[PDB]
Amino acid sequence: MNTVPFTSAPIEVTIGIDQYSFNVKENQPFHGIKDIPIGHVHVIHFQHADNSSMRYGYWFDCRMGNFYIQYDPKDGLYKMMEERDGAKFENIVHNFKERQMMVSYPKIDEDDTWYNLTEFVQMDKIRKIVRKDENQFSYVDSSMTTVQENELSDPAHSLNYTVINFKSREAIRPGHEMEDFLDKSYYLNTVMLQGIFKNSSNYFGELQFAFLNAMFFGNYGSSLQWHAMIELICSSATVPKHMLDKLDEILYYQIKTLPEQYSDILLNERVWNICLYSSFQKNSLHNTEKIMENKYPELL
């Protein structure tokens, strides 16, 4: 179990760690988060009490270094940093734990939610979507745009998701216009899976990472990417059976975890109704259809 110490909490903020969150009052004696499960990526995220505008945060993996949070009063945000002095870090964490100034990552033992949301998410792929090679952790926020969004303005601050566009020459083979537009199997299996992602684990990883950014930060371009990657699969007549089974489980946990109160802004009515009731895979997502119908029958 690893630890992300905080130098201090000078400004009132709601802090999230994975799907958990808690309120820290301005100048409250908060010095970080302990007992963080090793083996998974994690996200620590922030929303200031005084400006709910701008949810931001850091993707990190405690196996890749010792990380801490420190408020910057010039730039006005909680920043993640790496401590290279290993002895100083263990010493710091020991003192804060001894004085019980840290909240415990509150994982119930029955609870595989976070594993199921991040099953295919790897730090190394996150850092290829969020480019800032000088840090081992990756910053994301509400307002960052995607490479495809910038094609329709600061490139260093973009989310480099895989561009999916159903009316593109990449998607459509000359002479198979109708075939490839109505059955996207070629684009899924040959262009994307064999060509770009190499395997379905990498595809699912980007899909899961897009959902989580959309959900945690209200990142609109991530939400578009998550739906696009679902729709590409559901609109393909020929999909490996194992991918469909896994997709059903992935979406099931994503739908289970979504705040009921933001379903209206995180779920695209058209894509979901198409995927569950019209597409080639309309009969292949039993768990997802059942939770969708029982939790958001309005959307349908």
């Binding site: 009316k167 593109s168 020459r169 459509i172 216009e177 109708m178 537009f181």
Partner: protein
Amino acid sequence: GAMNSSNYAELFNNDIKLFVDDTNVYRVTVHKTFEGNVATKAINGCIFTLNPKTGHLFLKIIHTSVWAGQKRLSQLAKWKTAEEVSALVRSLPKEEQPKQIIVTRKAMLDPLEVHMLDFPNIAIRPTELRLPFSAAMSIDKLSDVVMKATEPQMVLFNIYDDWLDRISSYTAFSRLTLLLRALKTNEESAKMILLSDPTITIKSYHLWPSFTDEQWITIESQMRDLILTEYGRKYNV
């Protein structure tokens, strides 16, 4: 985006454009089978592709053989249309290619956009105008060439005959749409109007009779009456 009453004069400016109408591509008769079931028999169709400024009509005849062994023909017809329009543009010199293609039904938008991905500078647009191009098969010479065809064939027409010698393309288009609206609302009455006077003939290289300017005003008035007064017989006013 779309094309409607507000930007109507754009049709007659100097940017090459084409209207594409697919309503006569897939045509069937419905009949009873010996077992008493119902079956369709397809008949020849056509794609109606018109330059509204020049009157140039590219009439691609769709022979029934193109449906043989195919399923979901109404959906296929939209993609075949898009394939044929795309082939036409590719066959034209660059300086004759359209800058816009306006489809008369929104269901042609995606099939045409996909077939034209190679031409990202050609705008594909729908329209809110209810244009009467389906009545093209009520023009006798166009119907004749479509029904007689034994193979895929493209036939070229000027749907304005020689009218642009005397009137503007705006007026020529207004006349055409009035004639087609009339043929669509009451074909027999419309054709009676057009041919009643045996002395006004259709030249061999034309589609419509050789009316003088005065006779066209009379004709145009009679077509407006028809459209108002057939509207009466169908709608008790």
